[model samples]
Target: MPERLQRREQERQLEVERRKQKRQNQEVEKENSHFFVATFARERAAVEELLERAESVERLEEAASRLQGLQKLINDSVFFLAAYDLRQGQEALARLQAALAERRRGLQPKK
Candidate 1:
């Protein structure tokens, strides 16, 4: 019976679709690990340490250069990261900028 075979094929296709949907739902339920946020954290820590030890103009310039690189990376990653994760990265960059500004002022050689 042609109709009987068609019915069976349709049922099999439906089941496959159902399983695919279930797998997608499970994946959506899993928490994202925020890899970008972790990366920003590590880079921020390194820059903070560099700022702490920066004494000469050249060292401060290098630290500022590195911060600029990180800022660029974070800005470019905004589309890939979730809103909250992107916000976290932005906040980290802001903190680093503040620290760098303070250090640069300190290096200004008594005005």
Candidate 2:
């Protein structure tokens, strides 16, 4: 019973730290409007360009479905770059590239 109580206390303390970390992160993001806005606009245009090149409506719809994930990746990249966080930005860029590659592969014409 004592061990269980101590474990619960540890979990609660860890959760509080998490909430505090999340709050600080939100504050940082709130101060970075240009990063969010530019990322949002550029990501939307990128997705649209990809969709336009799609050979069929089905592929376009698939691109549309994946848009949110791509957008998040874009936002995270921009935020990381703006904050001088290169590692996270690179990871996000990788995700963005993967999504774009899927769209590009589908757009290729079959021989």
Candidate 3:
């Protein structure tokens, strides 16, 4: 039973990661950091939905895990970008935009 539970947990984690990654990838519009706010505009709704479906503890845990992943990505992006003053409100934003575009284009493929 322990092994079975572990397998299910792994599957749940994979599902969470896939959903979070797909949402992030899909939402990466070239609209400046406003995109982050827009991407997470429905976070409250997400939490509310989770609460409404509290019967599904497994799904709730997975969604919470995915939310944490999403938050980390957003937090890190903002931190690194802001550290370099990479907002369009200043001069650094243009270079930041270029780098982001290159990343989106898959600039360096993994071996």
Candidate 4:
């Protein structure tokens, strides 16, 4: 009876330790995802600002290049993202792409 009681206590302690480790892992995962969000959010903001400030042809090319870089960022990021996240990322990039196109239409002439 004593041995059984000790064994139960051991299991309880092990469970407590297990929960602690699990929580640690969860926190780590959360921070990693948070950083991913921070990076992409900053990147998108910078690209949008660049696009907005680009008035001349040279600067517009620079903005387009950065737009592609942002596109590839999400391309790489899509590998690790879940379904809804991937969809959201794509839509965000699409919006930026359309904005860039709109700016080009305003600034460039085909004729």
Candidate 5:
């Protein structure tokens, strides 16, 4: 009664071969883009921490000057990123600059 045994085996056999041929392409695609983002993330966090917790004009000025150099990185990163990603870095710098300006004015009070 099992004349279908061979037939059924062939049915699955086709897919087994097909599946074997299809073996794993493009697994866990990594990117240096991730590395770039992490660098910027740490840079942004450091600036935010400094701006948020400045105890005196000295460190405030330090972060402001550091922010100065940070802007240069955004410009430099422009060559590495697309327009979309460049804008992301650009906008980050803009916000940091604005915050630095606001804080600088506040911290440097007139006698």
Candidate 6:
């Protein structure tokens, strides 16, 4: 019974810490404005340029890695970015992924 009570206390403390962390994240996210727009534009341009430079699907491992990094940036900023902007950024990312997949398929040799 004592061990069970101690575990319950630990869980409650963890929940409180989680809520505190979320509040701090929200405060930070609410503090950005034009920075988000400019950064998103730059990232979109970089992705487009990467797609343009990719000549073969064989070389897309690097592009996939870059896309993952870009995704991390977007996800990390979700709390701060405007909802509409976030939606647009996600759409752009989806388009880029689709383009990469299509191009790779086209480049694949028939068996």
Question: Against the unseen true structure, what C-alpha lDDT does each candidate score?
Answer: 0.74, 0.58, 0.46, 0.75, 0.74, 0.73
Question: Across residues 1-111, which tens digit of lDDT does each residue of candidate 6 receive?
Answer: 555445567666766665775546656645576676677778867876786788877566677777777777778788766788778777777778876787777777666
Candidate 5, residues 30-102, lDDT tens digits: the string is 3556776898889988998888788778888888777777768767656667688778876887788777778
Please give me the total number of clashing residue pairs in predicted model 1. Answer: 0
List ranges where model 3 is wrong by over 4 Å.
Answer: 1-31, 80-111
Clashes of 5: 0
Cα lDDT for residue 1, model 3? 50
Return the clash pairs for model 1, or none: none
Q: Could you give candidate 1's per-residue lDDT for residues 1-111 as a string of tens digits?
A: 555445567666766765675556645523543566577778889998998888788888888887877877667766766687777777777778888888777777774
Better of 3 and 4 by lDDT: 4
Candidate 3, poorest ten consecutive residues by summed lDDT = 88-97
With a 3 Å backbone cut-off (N, CA, C), the pairs that clash in candidate 5 are none
- Per-residue alpha-carbon lDDT of model 2 for 42-76, expressed as tens digits? 77567656766667657666775656565455455
Better of 4 and 6 by lDDT: 4
Hey, what RMSD does candidate 3 come out at?
22.0
> Whose TM-score is higher: candidate 2's or candidate 3's?
3
* Model 6 / residue 57 / CA error / Å: 2.6
Identify the runs in model 1 with alpha carbons over 4 angstroms from their true place. 1-33, 109-111
For model 1 the local lDDT of residue 92 reads 73
RMSD of each: 9.7, 10.6, 22.0, 10.1, 11.2, 10.6
* Winner by TM-score between candidate 6 and candidate 4: 4
lDDT of 6 at 34: 69
| Candidate 5, residue 72: how far the Cα is off, in Å | 3.1
Model 3 Cα lDDT, one tens digit per residue, 14-46: 676666756566455445566655554455345
